[PDB]
Design a protein around this ligand. Structure first.
Ligand code: HEM
Ligand code: HEM
Ligand SMILES: CC(=O)C1=Nc2c(nc(N)[nH]c2=O)NC1(C)C
Ligand SMILES: CC(=O)C1=Nc2c(nc(N)[nH]c2=O)NC1(C)C
Ligand SMILES: NC(=[NH2+])NCCC[C@H](N)C(=O)O
Ligand SMILES: NC(=[NH2+])NCCC[C@H](N)C(=O)O
Lengths: 384, 386
C-alpha cells in the first residue's frame, strides 16, 4: 500500500513514504512518539536527555493521567503542526513562526491581553509576521479555554427580517452571540466583531479590540477609478482561532495562529462567493459587462479585476500579501524540500489549488496524497 | 442517514446521502452478465417478469456453450447510455439519455471501420448542430485479436518533434504522430495538421486512413473586441470524439467504441491552448494584450486566459457550432446531480475533473461535495495497442 505521485506537466514521479506514519497507555504512545520526534529534530536521539525526558513523561502520565510539555517542545510541536497541515499552501514558511507561550493564563481578561499582543506582534505595521499563541491545554476535569470567534478579526453579519444579510453572511451566528452577551451592534458592511473569550466553565466574556490594533486595507483598482467607490475594504491579519492544536496527545483548544493572506482568499472567496459578500454582479455592471448571458464570461472578468484590486491595494498600503501564482510556485518548492527531508508531504489538493485559474498554476498538475500526521491542527466543535 | 456517505453543498448548506455507491473465470463473466441483465430489466420495469428469467437462462446457456455471450440491440443501447451516465469524469451527463448508438458489431475490416467512423463524424457534426453519438465495433473475443482505434480521438492535431527539441503542433500527440509516420503517413509541418486514423482489425497490422478534409469541421478563432486575435491564426476542431476507451457492458468488452459530444469551452480555451505542455499560448496572448508578463502579481496569466476562453466561445457562436461555457455546463451538471439523487440515490463524480480549470469557485460545482466510485456499464482506460 505505497502511493505513486505524478506530476502531469513534467511527467515525473515521486513516492510518498511519509504516509506510513499516518486511554492512559494510548496518550503514552502518542507522547513517546512526540518526544522521539523532538530529540531527533535536535539530533539528540539516545542521549541521556532523551531517555530522562521519556521517563518524566512516563512518570507523569502513570500517576496523573496527563503530562506537560516544556517550552522548547511546544515551539517544535507548533511548527510541526503547521508543517503537517494538508490544507496550507503557505508551508514553505513553516520554520519561521513566533510561538507565544500563553499556558500561564487563568482568566478571559488575560487571554485578551495575550491576544492583543499577538495582533500587535503579527501585524507589525503591515510587515506581517507569522505567530501562534498557545493557551492552556484541555484537562479531563473541566471546560476548555476557548476563543468563540472563528478568527481574531472578522466582520459582523447582521440578518434582516427579510432574510438578507448586511455585512459578512459567514459571521451571522457569531454576530448574534455577541449581541446576546451585551454587544451593541453597528450597522455597516464592515464592522469588526468583538472577541468572545471563555475561561473554563464560565460564561464567555466580551472584549472590543482597540481599533488601532486592527489594520485594514481600503480596496481600489489600479486603473478603474470607480472601484474605490464600492467602499470595499479588508483586514490585514488572517488569524484562525477556532482550531485545536494537538501535540503529543495533548490538546490546546485555544491556540490562534496567523500568517498573511493569499490574495484569492479575499479577492475570490470572501468577496465573490455567492454566500459571502457576493459583489460579482455589481462589479460586472460597473465594468459595463453583459450580465444576461453566462457566455460573455462576465463572472470571470469581474473576478480577475477584483483579485487585481486586492493585490494592488495591499501593495499600495505596504501590507504583506501573496498572489496565488507566487504562493503555488513556492508550494511546489516546498513539496520538493519535503520529499528530500521526509520522503513526502501531506497535501489536500482541493484546498491547495486556487479558486480561480486552477490549471494556470503548477499545483493543478501535481498529484497529492492527503493524510493526517501529528502534531496537527484539527477542527473541534463550536463551544455553544 | 446511516453509513451511506453524507454529501454536503457548502454554498446552500444542504445535505444528501449517497445510497447508489452500495453497488460499486467464466463464473466471473456470468455474474457480471446477470447483474447487467437485471439492470436492463429494471430500466424497462420487468424485473421478475418471465422474459427477464428467460433472458438470464439464455445468457448462462450461451456462456456455458461458448465461454461468452451476445447482447440484444436494445441492451446495447441501454448499456452505452448507462456507461455515459455512470462516467464520473463527465460534466455533460445532463445529456445522457440523448445518445445516438450506431451498432457496428457486424464490422469485419479496417476499411469498414473507416466507413463507420466517417458516418459517425458526418452524423455527429451535422454542420455544427452537434449530436451525441457512439459507434460500437465488435466485442473482444477469446483467441481472436481486438478491434482497436490507435488514435486517442477521431480528430487530433499532429505534433512534430523539432531538430531543437521543441514541438510544432500539439505536444500531446507526438507519439501517435510518430506511429502514423512509421506506418507510412507523409507528415505535414503545420501547427494544426489533422492526423490520419490508424485502425486495426483483428490480428492485422493497423491500416492508415486520411479523413477527407470536408468531414472535419474546424473553427478559426477570433476575439469579439481584440481585433489582432484573429491574426494569431489559431483554430480548433468542432468534434470531440474519444476513441481509445474501452466500453464494458455486462462483462463484455468493446475495445473500439468511439463516442462524441460537444465541447465545453474550457477544454480548448484553458487546457488545449494554455497548458504549458500543450499549445502554451498564454504568454504570447498576454504580450499582445500588453500585460506585464515579468511579474506574477499583474495577473497576466488570468487575464489572458479569460480572453482566450472568450475567444473560443465567441468564435464557436459565430461559426454556429455547438459549444457550452463552463458556467452553463456546471449549472446543468448541478441539475443532473439533483435528477440523479431522485432517480438512483446518488451520482458518481470525480470532483477534480468536474470543477473547470479556470474560475473554479465561481461555478456551483466547486461548493458541492461529490463521491467518486466505479459503476458498470463503464467506460474504462485500456493499454495502448503497441
Ligand atoms: C505565511 C503565510 C500563510 C499563507 C499565505 C497561508 C495560506 C493558506 C491558505 C490559502 C489556506 C486555505 C485557507 C482557506 O481557504 O480558508 C491555509 C489554510 C491553513 N493554514 Fe495557512 N498560510 C499561512 C500561514 C499559516 C500559519 C502561520 C499556520 C499555523 C501555524 C497555518 C496553518 C494553516 C491551517 C491549519 C490551515 C487549514 C485551515 C482550515 O482548515 O480552515 N498557515 N493557509
Ligand atoms: C454532450 C456533450 C458533452 C460534454 C459537454 C461533455 C463534457 C465532458 C468534459 C469537459 C470531460 C472532461 C474531459 C477532459 O478534461 O479531458 C468529459 C469527460 C468524459 N465524458 Fe463527456 N461530455 C459530453 C458528452 C459525452 C458523451 C456522449 C460520452 C459518452 C457516451 C461522454 C463520456 C465521457 C467520458 C467517458 C469522459 C472521461 C474521459 C477521460 O477519462 O479521458 N461524454 N466530458
Ligand atoms: C466549499 C469547498 O468545497 C471548498 N472550499 C475550500 C477549498 N479550498 C480552500 N483553500 N478553501 C476552501 O474554503 N476547496 C474546497 C473545494 C474543499
Ligand atoms: C493534470 C491533472 O492533475 C488534472 N487533469 C484534469 C482534470 N480535470 C479534467 N476535466 N481534465 C483533466 O485532464 N483535473 C486533474 C487535476 C485531475
Ligand atoms: N492565509 C491564511 N493563513 N489564511 C487562513 C484562513 C483565512 C480565511 N481564508 C479568510 O479569507 O479570512
Ligand atoms: N466534451 C467532450 N466530449 N470532451 C471529451 C474530451 C476531449 C478533450 N478534453 C479535448 O479537449 O479534446
Amino acid at each position: 500500500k505505497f502511493p505513486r505521485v505524478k506530476n502531469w506537466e513534467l511527467g515525473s514521479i515521486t513516492y510518498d513514504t511519509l504516509c506510513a506514519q499516518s486511554p492512559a497507555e494510548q496518550l503514552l504512545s502518542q507522547a513517546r512518539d512526540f518526544i522521539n520526534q523532538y530529540y531527533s529534530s535536535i539530533k539528540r536521539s539516545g542521549s541521556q536527555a532523551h531517555e530522562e525526558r521519556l521517563q518524566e513523561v512516563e512518570a507523569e502520565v502513570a500517576s496523573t493521567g496527563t503530562y506537560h510539555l516544556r517550552e522548547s517542545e511546544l515551539v517544535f510541536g507548533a511548527k510541526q503542526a503547521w508543517r503537517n497541515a494538508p490544507r496550507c499552501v503557505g508551508r514553505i514558511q513553516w520554520g519561521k513562526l513566533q510561538v507565544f507561550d500563553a499556558r500561564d493564563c487563568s482568566s478571559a481578561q488575560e487571554m485578551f491581553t495575550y491576544i492583543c499582543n499577538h495582533i500587535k506582534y503579527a501585524t507589525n505595521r503591515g510587515n506581517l509576521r507569522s505567530a501562534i499563541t498557545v493557551f492552556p491545554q484541555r484537562a479531563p476535569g473541566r471546560g476548555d479555554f476557548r476563543i468563540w470567534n472563528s478568527q481574531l478579526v472578522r466582520y459582523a453579519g447582521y440578518r434582516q427580517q427579510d432574510g438578507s444579510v448586511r455585512g459578512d453572511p459567514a459571521n451571522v451566528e457569531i454576530t448574534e452571540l455577541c449581541i446576546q452577551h451585551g454587544w451593541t451592534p453597528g450597522n455597516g458592511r464592515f464592522d469588526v466583531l468583538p472577541l468572545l473569550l471563555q475561561a473554563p466553565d464560565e460564561a464567555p466574556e466580551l472584549f472590543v479590540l482597540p481599533p488601532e490594533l486592527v489594520l485594514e486595507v481600503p480596496l481600489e483598482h489600479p486603473t478603474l477609478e470607480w472601484f474605490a467607490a464600492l467602499g470595499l475594504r479588508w483586514y490585514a491579519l488572517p488569524a484562525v482561532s477556532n482550531m485545536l492544536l494537538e501535540i503529543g496527545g495533548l490538546e490546546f483548544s485555544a491556540a490562534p495562529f496567523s500568517g498573511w493572506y493569499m490574495s484569492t482568499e479575499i479577492g475570490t472567496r470572501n468577496l465573490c462567493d455567492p454566500h459571502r459578500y457576493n459583489i460579482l454582479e455589481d462589479v460586472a455592471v460597473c465594468m459595463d459587462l453583459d450580465t444576461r448571458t453566462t457566455s460573455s464570461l462576465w463572472k470571470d472578468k469581474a473576478a480577475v479585476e477584483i483579485n487585481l484590486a486586492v493585490l494592488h491595494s495591499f501593495q499600495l498600503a505596504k501590507v504583506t500579501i501573496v498572489d496565488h501564482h507566487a504562493a503555488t510556485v513556492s508550494f511546489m518548492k516546498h513539496l520538493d524540500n519535503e520529499q528530500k527531508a521526509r520522503g513526502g508531504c501531506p497535501a489536500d489538493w482541493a484546498w491547495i489549488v486556487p479558486p480561480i485559474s486552477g490549471s494556470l498554476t503548477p499545483v493543478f498538475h501535481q498529484e497529492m496524497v492527503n493524510y493526517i500526521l501529528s502534531p496537527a491542527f484539527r477542527y473541534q466543535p463550536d463551544p455553544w
